[PDB]
């Protein structure tokens, strides 16, 4: 049998006090007299206020004028009142003189930020989390905050940046940040008129929408009333561009596209005329900037419709492209000068496609001098400047037209895709890190076995060596060649007879075929179905927020055509008196919003 | 009902096809031979020995279409006056096209059709 | 530290009005006398009919004739 | 989850050297381990000589990890000729021991490619 | 993952295999230590029971 008996038993001093001598009679569960008179609202205290704040407000006003605890030794009454998120209790406690300890900063290395996390490191982290859980309270931000919207932005930012530094407790900081982000949006939901929606978004020019964008407040943006206001500044000259038919939209957009050199020659010779102002509306500026980029790519397709000259002069199309190239190199200097840049993955494809054009002009000039005459191209060296410039030009022609994909966020159908397909790419890049280990291991193994049988480029038919031959040979004879051989076998473009050798050894050929076969199994049956398995699970969790992320991205695409700096497309690119009334109206709007939001959250607590 | 989400995915693939066709034709149009210089007096990729795969834009687009199915041989990357820097760049552009189209943009289509079919099979009996 | 204090504070005109002088006793949550007599079915109106229609029908017939 | 201080979290994990964490590992108690306060205690024995290795930047982490990787034959020749010196104790911290064991295996595989 | 990383960490805590493979081949306190654990367990069980009884709402 297993005899059961109370280990580490408690004490039961008297029996007279079992029916309520000592007035501080702690029961088995540590419930004193006041704890029972508080749990049952019957109307030495210790910390009985924390047990009243945590249930309701009837006796909380009574205890406010008159060891084993269920609370950590760091919790303050105001901290627990903010954790509970009750408006009437936080108000009662804030009418008096209460304070909260300000947390130092994320990366604090001062005398006590190090000598407190080196003594406990558990009490410190718990105290910090409780302080941040009290500060991130929609009721402690409603009252006792000059503007609860900017405080919510800063708190959401600080808490999102704290779930990364604090490696553990990553699940509580994100829920606190999502609690602030949901409070800053549920306060803008209470605007009743449009006059008090432009007061909030223009505070301190949409000067608060930009602060929301720079803090990644994807729910403050993409609020229906915040987007219905931006869609009226976007279609600045198309009242009712939402009632029209899709054909009347297409034929009106193409009419503006075919007029981009006329709308752009004005504003240069008539900046304050009727026609000169028609390319300052953001939608027309957009249509003119994307119909000027479609003239630069249609002109790159014409550069293929006198090839023995070692250094040739520029052709007609290469003269007709140089203004676009110079305008693109210039317009990207300013943007990386009016700021830091690398967080936008489109600024790397735009910085690399402009360095390749520089290297192309820097090589077609080196070859215009230093090279006189015209010899047959059949006997040029491989490292000839004319052969490298024509390669860099094509490498950059690919990137110039892969950039038209950034223009998908402007559309309602292809925008959510392009946004949801770019979030499935950060989980591919960490899967193409596992495949590199397999590639390298099997390339090492396959080259260690086949490097004794490396023939010459003359011993082979047609005097040609490698796997890009009609009869593939020397597939595993060099490491640089083994890596390419194993890359091209993912697609089935490597023939099996490349496993044989001339001095046919039937044990090494079989081992070399078995290593190739196990590579094929690991890469095309195992590691390729796993990638689909991950993309299926990663896309289901993405399609929930697919409409908020797209609207946040389209808002940033829109806000880039609102200013006046880069108004003119790249081809022509190179040719306190009110500060107190404006601050006083915002305070009235905030007062009304907070009042009706509190009223809406109290009633809804049923 | 799974077809209206394919037609908007075959709009992203057209950008990739066009970009890589532009890039692959800008590099290979100097080495365009004639229909007589080639064996059996035949030119293009529908030959027994495929040749002139990236010499015209209309031919580059077909070459890049037929590589989705593995019907374009790798030796079409070479040229007669063998230049070993341009052949390698032309093989690397073809390889990155293959990676983007057959490992990235093709698994994404399956990932979308899986999610689009789960939301459809609920109303499958009323429709 | 972070000193906490009620910003944009309300008005609290009197203390005898806390126990129900003005009959239009707007509380901190803007609940007048009729709002409290409607939330609790105890049987200047303003728009107290909208607060009755939104909960139930006992006093809705009463406010519709007064 | 009810431990309030760190003095009473090292009493539990060291009972009968983390002698109770090992008994939890040998019983496959995947939730006892991976508790936030149990991992925040192991992460301070791991980074035994890097106070605040969680506040640093990823580039300062990379260039400090490769700096220790390129010094593995020097940190290892000590502890053999100076087991109780200043430099001889620098390869007893678990993170440095890890970086030296995985930079010695990357010298055996770079030598197999040669 | 955390359970696996903990076992990967615990393998570098000892002193046996401190040196990499290339150079690899070249009851007085047992009652106080047991008495403090019992107090810690008493407190943990007490506050866990308290937090579990109240939570049943
Ligand atoms: C790794 N491997 C391999 O390399 N070769 C190449 C050797 C010839 O050069 C093979 O023929 C080969 C092989 N595994 C093989 O059986 C599998 C069984 C189950 C799954 C599987 O995986 C997948 F489902 F197919 F994906 C493969 N077989 C076939 C075989 C050949 C001889 C004998 Cl006695 C038994 C089985
Ligand atoms: C884009 N690309 C390419 O074009 N070629 C053709 C060039 C020969 O003409 C390649 O050989 C080539 C290549 N990426 C390559 O490594 C990958 C790594 C990880 C994933 C991946 O993607 C996928 F998982 F396989 F799908 C590919 N390699 C192989 C390689 C070759 C030389 C060297 Cl030093 C290092 C790696």
Residue numbers in the entry:
A (entry chain A): 17 to 36, 61 to 83, 95 to 117, 135 to 272, 286 to 386, 392 to 426, 430 to 664, 703 to 733
B (entry chain D): 512 to 638
C (entry chain D): 17 to 36, 61 to 83, 95 to 117
D (entry chain B): 257 to 272, 286 to 383
E (entry chain B): 639 to 664, 703 to 733
Describing publication, verbatim:
Transient Receptor Potential Canonical (TRPC) proteins form homo- or heterotetrameric, non-selective cation channels permeable by Na+ and Ca2+1–6. TRPC4 and TRPC5 are the most closely related TRPC proteins (70% sequence identity) and can form functional, homomeric TRPC4:C4 and TRPC5:C5 channels. The N terminus (residues 1–366) folds into 4 ankyrin repeats, a helical linker domain and the pre-S1-elbow domain. The first four trans-membrane helices fold into a voltage sensing-like domain (VSLD); the next two helices form the pore domain, together with the re-entrant pore helix (E3 loop), which lines the ion permeation pathway.
For our structural studies, we engineered a human TRPC5 construct containing an N-terminal maltose-binding protein (MBP), followed by a PreScission protease site (PreS) and a C-terminally truncated (Δ766–975) hTRPC5 (99% identical to the analogous mTRPC5 construct). The cryo-EM structure of a human TRPC5:C5 channel in the presence of Pico145 was determined with a global resolution of 3.0 Å using C4 symmetry. We found that Pico145 binds between the trans-membrane domains of two TRPC5 subunits, where it displaces a phospholipid in a conserved lipid-binding site. However, the shape of this density was strikingly different to that in the mTRPC5 and mTRPC4 apo structures: in our structure, no density was observed for one of the lipid tails, and additional density was found between residues Q573, F569 and L572. Although this density was not consistent with a bound lipid, its shape and size were consistent with the presence of a molecule of Pico145. Similar to the phospholipid in the mTRPC5 and mTRPC4 apo structure, Pico145 was observed between two TRPC5 monomers, with four molecules of Pico145 per TRPC5 tetramer. The 3-hydroxypropyl substituent on N-1 of Pico145 interacts with the side chains of W577 and Q573, apparently substituting for the phospholipid phosphate group in the apo structures. Pico145’s xanthine core π-stacks with F576, and several residues (including L521, Y524, C525 and V579) interact with the 3-(trifluoromethoxy)phenoxy substituent on C8 of Pico145. Pico145 also makes additional interactions with helix S6 of the monomer on the left (monomer 2; blue): Pico145 interacts with T603 and packs against G606, and several hydrophobic amino acids (V610 and V614) interact with Pico145’s 3-(trifluoromethoxy)phenoxy substituent. However, the quality of our map was such that additional residues could be built within the region 175–187, and that residues 172–174 could be placed with greater accuracy. This region showed that histidine 172 and cysteines 176, 178 and 181 all point towards a central density, consistent with metal ion binding (see below for details).
